[PDB]
């Protein structure tokens with residue numbers, strides 16, 4: 027098996043029509059995917075994407091094509107033999123690095139390409155990605171990871187120790203995952219553009235469906251936020267766990283004041299109270315709003331930023347995203363850093379296929395990394411699943427473990443045509 | 448004056464022929480510019496660029512084209528009446544933000560576009576950019592800056608105090624600048640790929656020319672670094688200040704050992720000992736290599752990262768880049784933060800026309816912000832200046848202050864054709 031070529035698709039979805047996805051920073055996102063297919067001589071092709079919200083998708087497409095120079099011609103076996111090495115290779119063109127390094131368009135693109143390789147690998151061995159990785163030995167998992175710029179906080183040796191400690195009880199955890207699935211929260215009732223009436227109805231739906239955790243957007247208007255959360259609490263009941271998300275809009279002092287004003291709602295955490303680059307700022311906010319926790323990560327650019335968020339105690343909840351960074355391999359590195367510091371990972375999802383991606387990632391985290399899932403929640407959003415050949419399945423507040431070979435991200439063929447920008 | 452259109456040029460220079468620019472991370476860079484021209488109804492056009500090293504320049508081109516949607520159709524007076532507002536506007540399309548925010552391709556592109564506007568403004572009023580800004584009252588300069596995500600360490604009120612304090616001495620400093628220029632160091636002798644013979648010759652030339660500070664590449668091979676720095680000290684003499692640059696290649700523990708091993712050479716500082724995102728890492732390296740100083744910043748993505756580097760005391764020398772970030776306005780913000788913490792700013796230069804840019808920026812810093820230049824050094828490199836209509840002029844180890852209208856970045860027409868990729 028050789029990667030013999032690649033195709034790209036600038037796919038954009040009219041989510042702004044009903045303001046699905048709307049928040050304090052992004053009032054009218056058009057959920058989009060910079061989509062890549064890695065060609066082989068064989069029966070399988072590697073599908074992958076990275077998520078954007080409309081304009082700018084074509085920049086990610088440009089970056090994917092640039093990265094293709096590094097991937098077309100590779101033997102899949104050379105990749106599998108040491109994927110950490112492949113990861114260094116694909117993020118290691120010094121000239122392409124200049125455009126980053128490991129941030130912005132070039133890293134979004136790497137997420138798509140790297141995950142497409144995983145899709146191909148999984149399809150070839152006949153396993154869903156979560157099982158492909160979960161079945162690996164500690165050394166095999168360790169080999170997937172490029173540790174460059176991590177070693178002062180988590181060196182390979184300490185990562186290997188964590189992996190070995192998790193190894194006993196994988197089989198039992200795999201069985202448990204099959205029986206129970208992995209718990210998730212819903213953001214579906216929370217988009218900032220929704221009318222109060224729509225908020226009420228969707229809160230009731232979320233409660234009826236069996237979700238125990240629900241997330242709501244805040245951050246544009248304090249009066250609106252107080253009203254909305256009061257209404258949300260009314261419909262949801264006192265037992266429901268509520269979280270809130272400001273989407274980066276606040277200054278540090280502003281964040282502290284505003285969150286504390288929403289304390290009556292008993293939010294578990296505030297997500298992204300400020301810029302996703304501001305480690306020290308998140309830490310300041312964290313101290314100022316305790317016992318309300320702080321979550322961030324959906325735009326955290328790479329493992330180097332995550333390691334500083336985690337090591338400095340700037341956050342309570344680590345929200346990795348499946349394709350913001352360099353795909354699965356870098357996510358795994360961050361999950362290991364989080365495990366060292368005993369911080370829970372609650373992945374960002376929704377978007378286009380992000381649920382499809384992160385379901386696998388958390389399941390690896392549960393089976394082979396930290397061994398705990400019950401107190402955690404993967405994000406879930408009920409948008410755009412009809413475009414996927416193997417959509418995530420969620421019922422009673424939990425993702426069912428994927429069965430199909432691959433990374434669950436492959437779209438129906440018609441979608442690749444109808445939504446081409 | 449109205450911005451009526453824009454043209455882009457993917458310009459790439461074969462600098463890898465002689466390994467000019469070569470370092471431990473980037474063995475064969477091809478100095479490139481994603482170049483932009485803003486068209487108007489009148490007689491001036493706004494020229495700007497952002498700098499890359501070859502492959503990936505086309506991603507910046509795509510990002511510039513994307514930003515064009517925010518700039519084409521704008522009236523220049525609207526921009527001029529509140530530059531901070533324009534800056535927020537150009538970096539604040541929430542969809543284009545997703546591709547960053549304020550990092551990677553989209554922000555490199557912002558640097559080009561923002562600086563091109565400055566070029567147009569400066570041409571319209573008939574002044575070099577440095578003097579255009581220097582002639583401004585403190586309130587007018589404050590107005591240039593978008594302070595979002597800065598207010599926890601520098602809020603507009605305190606930035607104005609800094610600016611007002613520098614106010615009375617401006618006239619004297621301008622006279623002094625006209626008289627003395629602004630001191631600069633040279634990297635012309637330091638590229639890692641040069642032979643020892645060429646190293647000797649360039650060291651002798653740098654010494655004869657009157658530079659008091661000279662920078663050398665290190666970090667690929669310890670034995671090479673020891674020999675080369677021994678040669679450099681021999682050729683440059685004891686009075687010369689030698690600095691070294693590792694271009695991000697090391698882990699924290701590795702950086703400390705390697706730098707300390709070069710202590711015999713008396714390096715003033717180590718530049719980019721590790722990843723440009725690792726604030727806490729630079730701080731640890733800084734503690735480990737004392738008294739050798741730490742410099743970083745040429746790839747520092749934005750004001751938010753710089754703010755943290757500075758406030759946490761993670762570096763000794765702040766190396767802003769003219770077009771890595773959102774152009775002049777964001778640089779001025781960082782310079783004000785630096786002034787608060789009394790950290791010197793020594794801008795990164797070389798590349799394609801970076802010298803031509805940063806000369807203006809440091810002179811603004813001298814005249815209107817921190818009021819001190821004698822102890823500092825702007826980077827200078829003698830490459831590619833023949834492509835510019837008004838190239839920088841260096842003699843006796845000092846930049847002559849620009850005197851022609853504009854930002855000194857406009858290239859000769861023949862170059863725009865001859866070097867199109």
Ligand SMILES: O=C(NO)[C@H](O)[C@H](O)CO
Nearest residue numbers: 047048049052055271273
């Ligand atoms: O913040 C988010 N989820 O938590 C979304 O990515 C954002 O609101 C865009 O729809």
Ligand SMILES: O=C(NO)[C@H](O)[C@H](O)CO
Nearest residue numbers: 468469470473476692694
């Ligand atoms: O590091 C640098 N100057 O300090 C250069 O940008 C780099 O070496 C690329 O030529």
Ligand SMILES: [Mg+2]
Nearest residue numbers: 271297298324
């Ligand atoms: Mg969010």
Ligand SMILES: [Mg+2]
Nearest residue numbers: 692718719745
């Ligand atoms: Mg450098």
